[PDB]
């Protein structure tokens, strides 16, 4: 029993995983076993979603999150997002699940049977947290694996069936992307956009050409950056700036994953391109714009001149102007005038919504998509009761966008607390006073009085 | 040494659960108030007093079970089992709400016994009875809310019902009818509770981050001995830290821990005084100068006038079912509603 | 030393009365700007059309408000999440009409408070302390982020954020109840358990230490003089307090470790506020509290009401009355 009690290690059982900081062999078995748990859930949940899958119902009415991730990649869907073959969903679930046993075998082996420290076995796999040259090499190796995966998405879009394009003409369909956006003014133009309303930073991407072209740049940068850090050692200005310890490196990734956690939460809640509404349901702004659209169609059929109808406040009951002048829907949805969706763009003109296209160019499929999304707004209770907070028990529905956004926000916040925790201790541990204040060498006792 | 001094020696025996003279009143009263709530929230209904299901037997969960108050027709009756209402019948005693007074009265004498227990144990150990004094704020809240408020109202019906979802109804009732948020005494109570949770978090975190190194392990909890005579954390360093971060800081240990006694106790005491005024419908409901201006000016609007429209909506929608004895019948054309909604 | 060295030595100097630090370099200008704007707006700001329906709400003192009713009105509903600084308006009279000062305040405030949290770590690092004091401060900071930024993001407009006033705060609480049933959310219940238990544990820890102060003063002088600033000896008897509180319940429900006890004093209220901040943040995406409306049914099919249905009647009252003129369609979706 090496470093397995509090006396020999210094860590209680609630901090017992911290006994692996200086045990490379056992620590490797922990990351390989945890990686097996990740692939285990990805395969088991898909088979669970497939066995409970009803093809005639929408995916957002069945509480699916993984099948929509597969359906977005163009596997198993047809025109309009309708499922035509459920076998690709079965393959992804089985192969991920089967691969979990391989990761699990190596995780259990390296953790109880293998060598406790890799410094003895191999000079290539043994490492030191203070080895600045070796740490960047492991960073560069994993950077290349990430760059390859970013290019695997590009190969799927260009050479293996393509992606599902909700903005495809004539309706959503699977489409192969042949001309990815290589222009750096458009790709890197997303990063410099404002994150506030009307811009939205990178969430406002609304076509697959800007998506695939971006993953080409991300793939090439990681490869070029991976080869960089493998051949180089950290410069002096970076050596005097960062804390070089095992706990400090984990604190950097916790702050990085927490930052990425907030990004995915806003990605699924606002963007309907990489998260098509046919799989994840209409967004918050999407369903709100659908209610004004639905009753605009209803009252106009009854003979209401929606262009001249004046609401109780003086604004237009159906249509008004944005602060910059664009013709937008009226009511509380004036906040949601930045919404862009494939079922609404045909009615939009140079100055916004066109009244002539509103009177004569509204199609029945636009009316059905407006009523379906309106009654599937991302509103629900914790026990899965669809509707507003005052709705009676009847509908069993909570939008997957609400399940994905709320979950990854709770995870994003706690991982920020993990940053503030482990990064604060890494500073104190490297300085040498994380265990308390020296009674015979108290620093404050050697300082002048404040007043 | 007689029988009284013999019984006194047995009550004050050093056992796993201390008894004491206060235990003759505490343990049976505290056991009946707890068992009375558990028995009611599992089997006893509220269909004849409120028209509601309030037990696990009828189909409620942990959040909606309750021991509801007696009907409004009962008045401020004690609702004793042998009394004129139940007439010695136990089943009819449950159907009329006799459990609520059974829990409120036996629970009131239990809080008296627990505070007597704090006095008795502190004297035998040889310490000051400050925990007993601090416990006067919880007693002041229970007396003013579960007893003083309904006795000033029409009956026990408008007292809090022993339930999770029933207490949440009690919060929304005081908002729409009393405007309890606008009362300055509840404001002083909010500052005492939130300020108390502030002192609780900021003191424990300051001690843990100003500790001395009395051990070599990473888990610093074993570096403490209850018999030690030295302070376990640097009061000097903690004083300089909060003086440079916040501007002011504590410099006295005894004043700091009494300060933690004063803030939460004073808050609940002030909120109790406001509830006593609510028993007579003496509310901080309105600002007269605001209403005179808004009545003559249809363009004057503040958050004060907007919250009253919510209070007027709360009363009109819940009163027919929340007060069934009144037999309210509100047509659709009299319900205050905004546009569209 | 050159110019930059002596400037860095003064910024990170531990001898300053109010410590600055690099986190304070951003905190000082941001908090001063938000404070100067708030005091001026709370006194002389003209009415603001918060709900974007050309119905301004008076908020400042010079326009007929008191301390309880005065507030800094949020930005217009027509603005939404759009960044609205001063230079984006055609005039200050327009900037004041559409709720300009609100965005200037809550943005400079959230920036300064975040730097205030990092400033708490910075002083702890220069003094040789453990740095997790700011972790406890992350609970009230995340609560401010939830009602000022996270909830407006989920709803698509800063007009739904909590106002900057006493009566305005009450309006934010009531509307949140009707639209989310926050009282029935287990995270707000955890938050109440954190603040109710915190006030309990604050009074409990304070009444036990004071009840065991070793006699150093007499009866004609305050007992606080029994402690001298910077002494080595503990001012109270933890074993005597453990001897009392160990018998009020039972011996083992009482703490004999001062470090483990004070850690519990910091864990319970902070973990409670962490969840209620996540409650407002998760309900910002409309994952609302439990719905048990029409859940109890008799053998025929009649609705047997409960206390959950009574709460629904109160919510309907808040629902149909809030923003009475801002709705033209039957469903309030945001």
């Amino acid at each position: 029993a090496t470093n397995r009690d509090q006396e020999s290690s210094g860590f209680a059982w609630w901090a017992g995983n911290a006994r692996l900081i200086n045990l490379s062999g056992k620590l490797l078995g922990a990351h390989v076993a945890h990686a097996g748990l990740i692939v285990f859930w990805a395969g088991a949940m898909t088979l669970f979603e497939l066995a409970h899958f009803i093809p005639e119902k929408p995916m957002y009415e069945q509480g699916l999150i993984l099948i929509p991730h597969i359906a977005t990649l163009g596997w198993g869907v047809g025109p309009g997002g309708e499922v035509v073959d459920t076998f690709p969903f079965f393959v992804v679930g089985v192969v991920h699940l089967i691969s979990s046993a391989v990761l699990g075998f190596g995780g259990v082996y390296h953790a109880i049977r293998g060598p406790e420290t890799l410094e003895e076995y191999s000079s290539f796999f043994g490492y030191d947290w203070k080895d600045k040259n070796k740490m960047t090499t492991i960073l560069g190796f994993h950077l290349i694996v990430l760059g390859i995966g970013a290019l695997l998405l590009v190969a799927k879009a260009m050479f293996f069936g393509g992606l599902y394009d909700t903005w495809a003409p004539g309706g959503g369909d699977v489409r192969v992307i042949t001309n990815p956006t290589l222009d750096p003014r458009v790709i890197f133009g997303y990063l410099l956009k404002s994150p506030f309303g009307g811009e939205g930073w990178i969430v406002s991407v609304n076509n697959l050409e800007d998506v695939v072209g971006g993953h080409i740049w991300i793939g090439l940068i990681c490869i070029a950056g991976g080869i960089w850090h493998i051949l180089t050692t950290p410069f002096g200005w970076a050596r005097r700036a960062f804390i070089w310890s095992g706990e400090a490196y984990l604190s950097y990734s916790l702050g990085a994953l927490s930052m990425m956690g907030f990004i995915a939460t806003c990605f699924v809640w606002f963007n309907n391109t990489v998260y098509p509404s046919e799989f994840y349901g209409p967004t918050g702004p999407e369903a709100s714009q659908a209610q004004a659209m639905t009753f605009l169609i209803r009252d106009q059929k009854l003979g209401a001149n929606v262009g001249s109808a004046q609401g109780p406040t003086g604004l237009g009951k159906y249509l008004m102007r944005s602060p910059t002048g664009e013709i937008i829907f009226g009511g509380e949805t004036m906040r949601f005038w930045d919404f862009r969706g494939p079922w609404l763009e045909p009615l939009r003109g140079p100055n916004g919504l066109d009244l002539n296209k509103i009177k004569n160019d509204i199609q029945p499929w636009q009316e059905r998509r407006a009523a379906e999304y309106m009654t599937h707004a991302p509103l629900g209770s914790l026990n899965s009761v669809g509707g507003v907070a005052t709705e009676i028990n009847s509908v069993n529905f909570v939008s997957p966008r609400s399940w994905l956004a709320t979950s990854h926000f709770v995870l994003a916040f706690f991982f920020l607390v993990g940053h503030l925790w482990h990064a604060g201790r890494a500073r104190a541990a490297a300085a040498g006073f994380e265990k308390g204040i020296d009674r015979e060498s108290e620093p404050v006792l050697s300082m002048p009085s404040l007043d | 040494r007689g029988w009284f001094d013999i019984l006194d020696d047995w009550l004050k025996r050093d056992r796993f659960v201390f008894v004491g003279w206060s235990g003759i009143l505490l343990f049976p009263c505290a056991y009946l108030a707890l068992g009375g709530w558990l028995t009611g929230t599992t089997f006893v209904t509220s269909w004849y007093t409120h028209g509601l299901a309030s037990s696990y037997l009828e189909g409620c969960n942990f959040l909606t079970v309750a021991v509801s108050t007696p009907a409004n027709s009962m008045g401020h009756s004690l609702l004793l089992l042998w009394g004129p209402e139940a007439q010695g019948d136990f089943t009819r005693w449950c159907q009329l709400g006799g459990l609520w007074t059974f829990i409120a009265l036996h629970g009131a004498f239990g809080l008296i016994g627990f505070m007597l227990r704090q006095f008795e144990i502190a004297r035998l150990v040889g310490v000051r009875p400050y925990n007993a004094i601090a416990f006067s704020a919880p007693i002041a809240v229970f007396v003013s809310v579960f007893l003083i408020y309904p006795l000033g109202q029409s009956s026990w019906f408008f007292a809090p019902s022993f339930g999770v979802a029933a207490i949440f109804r009690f919060l929304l009732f005081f908002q729409g009818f009393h405007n309890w948020t606008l009362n300055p005494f509840h404001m002083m109570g909010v500052a005492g509770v939130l300020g108390g949770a502030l002192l609780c978090a900021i003191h424990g975190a300051t001690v843990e981050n100003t500790l001395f190194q009395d051990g070599e392990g990473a888990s610093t909890f074993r570096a403490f001995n209850p018999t030690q005579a030295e302070e376990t954390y640097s009061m000097v360093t903690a004083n300089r830290f909060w003086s440079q971060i916040f501007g002011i800081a504590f410099s006295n240990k005894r004043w700091l821990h009494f300060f933690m006694l004063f803030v939460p106790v004073t808050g609940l005491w002030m909120s109790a005084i406001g509830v006593v005024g609510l028993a007579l419908n003496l509310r901080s409901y309105d600002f007269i100068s605001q209403e005179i201006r808004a009545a003559e000016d249809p363009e004057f609007e503040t958050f004060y006038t907007k919250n009253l429209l919510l209070n007027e909506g709360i009363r009109a929608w819940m009163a027919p079912q929340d007060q069934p004895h009144e037999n309210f019948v509100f047509p659709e054309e009299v319900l205050p509603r905004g546009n569209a909604l | 030393a050159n110019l930059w060295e002596r400037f860095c030595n003064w910024v990170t100097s531990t001898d300053n009365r109010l410590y600055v630090g690099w986190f304070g370099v951003i905190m000082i200008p941001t908090l001063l700007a938000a404070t100067i704007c708030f005091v001026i707006a709370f006194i002389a700001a003209p009415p603001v059309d918060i709900d974007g329906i050309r119905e301004p709400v008076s908020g400042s003192l010079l326009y007929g408000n008191n301390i309880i009713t005065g507030a800094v009105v949020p930005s217009s509903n027509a603005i939404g999440l759009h960044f609205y600084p001063i230079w984006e308006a055609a005039s200050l009279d327009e900037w004041l009409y559409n709720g300009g000062p609100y965005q200037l305040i809550i943005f400079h405030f959230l920036l300064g408070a975040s730097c205030y949290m990092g400033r708490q770590w910075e002083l702890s690092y220069r003094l040789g302390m453990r740095p997790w004091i700011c972790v406890a401060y992350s609970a009230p900071l995340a609560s401010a982020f939830a009602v000022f930024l996270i909830y407006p993001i989920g709803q698509g407009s800063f007009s739904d954020g909590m106002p900057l006033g006493i009566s305005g705060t009450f309006n934010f609480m009531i509307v949140f109840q009707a639209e989310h049933n926050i009282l029935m959310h287990p995270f707000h219940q955890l938050g109440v358990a954190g603040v109710f238990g915190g006030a309990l544990f604050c009074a409990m820890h304070g009444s036990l230490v004071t009840s065991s102060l070793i006699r150093e003063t007499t009866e004609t002088e305050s007992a606080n003089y029994g402690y001298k600033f910077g002494q080595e000896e503990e001012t109270y008897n933890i074993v005597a307090a453990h001897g009392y509180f160990g018998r009020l319940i039972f011996q083992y429900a009482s703490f004999n470790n001062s470090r483990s006890l004070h850690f519990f004093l910091a864990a319970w209220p902070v973990v409670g506020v962490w969840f209620t901040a996540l409650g407002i943040s998760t309900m910002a995406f409309n994952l609302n509290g439990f719905n048990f409306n029409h859940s109890v049914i008799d053998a025929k099919g009649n609705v047997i009401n409960t206390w959950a249905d009574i709460i629904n009647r109160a919510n309907l009252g808040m629902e149909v009355m809030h923003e009475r003129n801002a709705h033209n369609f039957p469903l309030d979706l945001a």
Binding site: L450 | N239, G247 | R17, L18, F229
Partner: peptide, 30 residues
């Protein structure tokens, strides 16, 4: 008189912050 009273009471609290911080009684290691 209302606005003047509120601002007067508020200004006295800010002035009290100034004297309580910079003119506090200095704590000394006795």
């Amino acid at each position: 008189m209302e606005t003047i009273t509120y601002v007067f009471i508020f200004a006295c609290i800010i002035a009290l912050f100034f004297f309580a911080i910079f003119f506090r009684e200095p704590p000394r290691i006795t």
